[PDB]
């Protein structure tokens, strides 16, 4: 049997990797960060409340100027907010009301959105006539779009529910690279600060590190027990954090190739929907299904605070590039800024 | 003068929220529905009775606008994209009653069980279309297909007294099609604290009364939603 022979040779390769990872596990992260000072209680107040959307907010994304943010809601609207003055800059009606992700271009000239329509629609904000129009639609994917992120004005990376991630040329509208290897719906992706790599977590309880230029899977990270819903890179780009349905957040190191820390509590029995780091990476903010976001000490694995101002499931959350505020959207149709 | 830029911001925000309340009136007036069903169930025949990753069908019954969404070009792993439909008025779950000999009926009983007990779909009512009743009748009328093989509790099942048989139909078809309904109603009544309900209907794919069944069931769902806001029920 050639099939079983390939199955047993994969088992020995998994045992070789598992023992090579254990040889590097000399000390735990809790043993290294034992004597550092705890952060203390993190008391954060709601500074702004954005009350424009009609349905549940599924995604949001900050602009690189740390003042404007885009918000996607399943009533079919993309609202650009001025977070300082709470004013609405733009309101884009979408063709599909089932948007599940939205991105803000680093240049600030474009926004993207996608969902169950399996299409990533690029919207040009800086149009000559002055009002936003759809400039491009990317229709290669065969499953729902879970996440999309801009590399530059002409490149965008999208993860989809067809267990595949893809890289797109925007002016030509064609897939330039496809990333295969996941066996479940890829739920999120996170670009590295250098944007040479990105990490994606799927519904196979696994996360994979991809090389953008070569389109290959570099490393595979296991340890979770259920589907990974959210993922976020560490500020330096040498680690990332995953949130899963097993009610646990975990921190994985790229160079160690294994998980370093686990963020769990016996009272927490709901899955994580969003994760984000602070500007320094000391705090790990995670949105949960129990309607409140918890702040974790990323080094001590101790809960440092709670953001309990939302009346429904916290679906998205993001920290500004300058680190000044945190914006959390939720299914209660509101978006709150915390500081 | 920086005050000019902020006055231009207030006038731009003023134009947007003028449009956002025009869209609020349209959004609240429309009633969204999720048409869910497996293959070989007659689901696609109902939308013709009235690639892309989701198909939208707009219809209007008694000046009330309904927006029905049919999931297409998606994998059979539904546990993620099914959460997007927690705010719909009802989920139209289409089942093939003739498919019990595989055992597609047990596959649909487990899918209905997962939808009923999902934490995000616990307030979403389900409109159950026990489709393919015309094909079930021909299958039951013959002695070749015995539902006792795939469901051994059918050997002691008796038709309930409240069962209303269609005019001029076999009791063996009445007992068969009502047994299948009780298999779904046993799951529906096992859990649920009055938050959501199940509305079973004996359906054919070519039936014209299908849009009126959804209209009358959605009118019940909205009515119970109003009664719950006043703590009356």
């Amino acid at each position: 049997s050639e099939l079983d022979q390939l199955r047993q040779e994969a088992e020995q390769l998994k045992n070789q990797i598992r023992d090579a990872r254990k040889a590097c596990a000399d000390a735990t992260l809790s043993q290294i960060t034992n004597n550092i000072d705890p952060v203390g209680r993190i008391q954060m107040r709601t500074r702004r409340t954005l009350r424009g959307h009609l349905a549940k907010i599924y995604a949001m994304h900050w602009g690189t100027d740390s003042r404007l943010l885009v918000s996607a809601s399943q009533d079919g609207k993309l609202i650009i907010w001025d977070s300082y003055t709470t004013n609405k800059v733009h309101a884009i009606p979408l063709r599909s009301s089932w948007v599940m992700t939205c991105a803000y271009a680093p240049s600030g000239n474009y926004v993207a959105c996608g969902g169950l329509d399996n299409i990533c629609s690029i919207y040009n904000l800086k149009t000559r006539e002055g009002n936003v129009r759809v400039s491009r639609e990317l229709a290669g994917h065969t499953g729902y779009l879970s996440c999309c992120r801009f590399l530059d004005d002409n490149q965008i990376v999208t993860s989809s529910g067809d267990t595949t991630c893809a890289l797109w040329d925007i002016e030509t509208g064609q897939q330039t690279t496809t990333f295969t290897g996941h066996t479940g719906d890829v739920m999120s992706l996170s670009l590295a600060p250098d944007t040479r790599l990105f990490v994606s977590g799927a519904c196979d309880a696994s996360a994979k590190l991809w090389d953008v230029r070569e389109g290959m899977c570099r490393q595979t990270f296991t340890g979770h027990e259920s589907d990974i819903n959210a993922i976020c890179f560490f500020p330096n780009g040498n680690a990332f954090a995953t949130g899963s349905d097993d009610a646990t957040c975990r921190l994985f190191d790229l160079r160690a190739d294994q998980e370093l820390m686990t963020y769990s509590h016996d009272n927490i029995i709901c899955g994580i929907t969003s994760v984000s780091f602070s500007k320094s990476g000391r705090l790990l903010l995670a949105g949960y299904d129990d309607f409140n976001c918890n702040v974790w000490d990323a080094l001590k694995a101790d809960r440092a605070g709670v953001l309990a101002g939302h009346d429904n499931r916290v679906s998205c959350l993001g920290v500004t590039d300058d680190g000044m505020a945190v914006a959390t959207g939720s299914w209660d149709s509101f978006l709150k800024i915390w500081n | 003068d920086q005050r000019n830029e902020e006055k231009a911001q207030r006038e731009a925000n003023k134009k947007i929220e003028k449009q956002l309340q025009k869209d609020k009136q349209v959004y609240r007036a429309t009633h969204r529905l999720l048409l869910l069903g497996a293959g070989e169930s007659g689901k696609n025949t109902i939308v013709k009775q009235m690639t892309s990753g989701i198909f939208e069908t707009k219809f209007q019954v008694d000046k009330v606008n309904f927006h029905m969404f049919d999931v297409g070009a998606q994998r059979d792993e539904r546990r993620k994209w099914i959460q997007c439909f927690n705010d719909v008025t009802a989920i139209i779950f289409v089942v093939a009653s003739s498919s019990y000999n595989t055992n597609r009926l047990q596959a649909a009983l487990k899918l209905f069980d997962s939808i009923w007990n999902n934490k995000w779909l616990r307030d979403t009512s389900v409109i159950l279309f026990l489709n393919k009743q015309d094909l079930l009748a021909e299958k039951v009328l013959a002695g070749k297909s015995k539902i006792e093989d795939y469901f051994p509790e059918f050997a002691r099942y008796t038709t309930p007294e409240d069962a209303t048989p269609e005019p001029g139909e076999d009791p063996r078809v009445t007992r068969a099609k009502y047994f299948i309904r009780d298999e779904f109603l046993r799951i529906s009544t096992a859990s649920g604290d009055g938050r959501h309900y199940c509305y079973p209907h004996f359906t054919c794919a070519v039936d014209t009364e299908n849009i009126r069944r959804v209209f009358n069931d959605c009118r019940d769902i909205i009515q119970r939603m109003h009664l719950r806001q006043y703590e009356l029920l």
């Epitope: 027990e225 589907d227 097993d246 | 792993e77 069980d113 007990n117 934490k119 859990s191």
Partner: nanobody
């Protein structure tokens, strides 16, 4: 690393008995509902039996009621399936399937064609 390994199987005479075992690793066995599914030659995945987190609620597919018995040992992290009065229609590859999320009443996508939290299966052949 969630791993499910099934042991047992083999060629049985009609009316014989067999006991399938499922060794689970990589997760908390007691927090999840366990399932049994099979795939007959030239057919799709078919759900057989399930057992709750504790072991109180037990459900069977109609074809196997009275002949099959599902059991879980939360201490040893094992799932059992005592198969009695085996018919030639029982010949299939029996997979040990795990529910996708813990502490949930719903069990989604267990009989999918590509499901992660499912073992590779054991071949059970009932013949003479």
């Amino acid at each position: 690393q969630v791993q499910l390994q099934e042991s047992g199987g083999g060629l049985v005479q009609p009316g014989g008995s067999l006991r399938l075992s499922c060794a689970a690793s990589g997760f908390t066995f007691s927090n999840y509902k366990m399932n049994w599914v099979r795939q007959a030659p030239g057919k799709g995945l078919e759900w057989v039996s399930d057992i709750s987190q504790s072991g109180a609620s037990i459900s069977y597919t109609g074809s196997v009621k009275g002949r099959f018995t599902i059991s879980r040992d939360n201490a040893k992290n094992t799932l059992y399936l005592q198969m009695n009065s085996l018919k030639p229609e029982d010949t299939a590859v029996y997979y040990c399937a795990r529910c996708p999320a813990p502490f949930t009443r719903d069990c989604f996508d267990v009989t999918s064609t590509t499901y992660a939290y499912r073992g590779q299966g054991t071949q059970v052949t009932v013949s003479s």
